[PDB]
Design a protein around this ligand. Sequence first.
Ligand SMILES: O=C(O)CCc1nc2ccccc2c(=O)n1CC(=O)NCc1ccccc1
Ligand SMILES: [Zn+2]
Ligand SMILES: [Zn+2]
Ligand SMILES: [Zn+2]
Length: 99
Amino acid sequence: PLPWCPHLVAVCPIPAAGLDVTQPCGDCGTIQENWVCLSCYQVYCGRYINGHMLQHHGNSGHPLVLSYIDLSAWCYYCQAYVHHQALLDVKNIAHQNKF
Ligand SMILES: O=C(O)CCc1nc2ccccc2c(=O)n1CC(=O)NCc1ccccc1
Ligand SMILES: [Zn+2]
Ligand SMILES: [Zn+2]
Ligand SMILES: [Zn+2]
């Protein structure tokens, strides 16, 4: 992945309740292939399901999303995976909740 991107500044502190990697898509309620937004912590499905996180990106401009499948982080603007110290806490919390 990229070791940095200019959108890491938009990564916000982890939600009150923590992360729930089994949380369904906030639009369609699918359990499959969800991502969490690293700005606002809404959960929406991936492009191969119904594309709700890509719709969220378009209507919010929020850049960075974390996969509840493989804990990869995608930047929609840089069109790349990103891994950096600023993402360790959210990835560690998601990993603890999943495994
Ligand atoms: O789906 C989203 O909405 C967010 C992830 C994403 N969005 C894109 C939007 C447009 C074009 C390409 C991508 C892309 O490769 N990714 C990354 C991606 O889909 N990687 C494969 C993958 C990784 C983990 C879990 C499921 C799929
Ligand atoms: Zn959906
Ligand atoms: Zn968001
Ligand atoms: Zn970026």
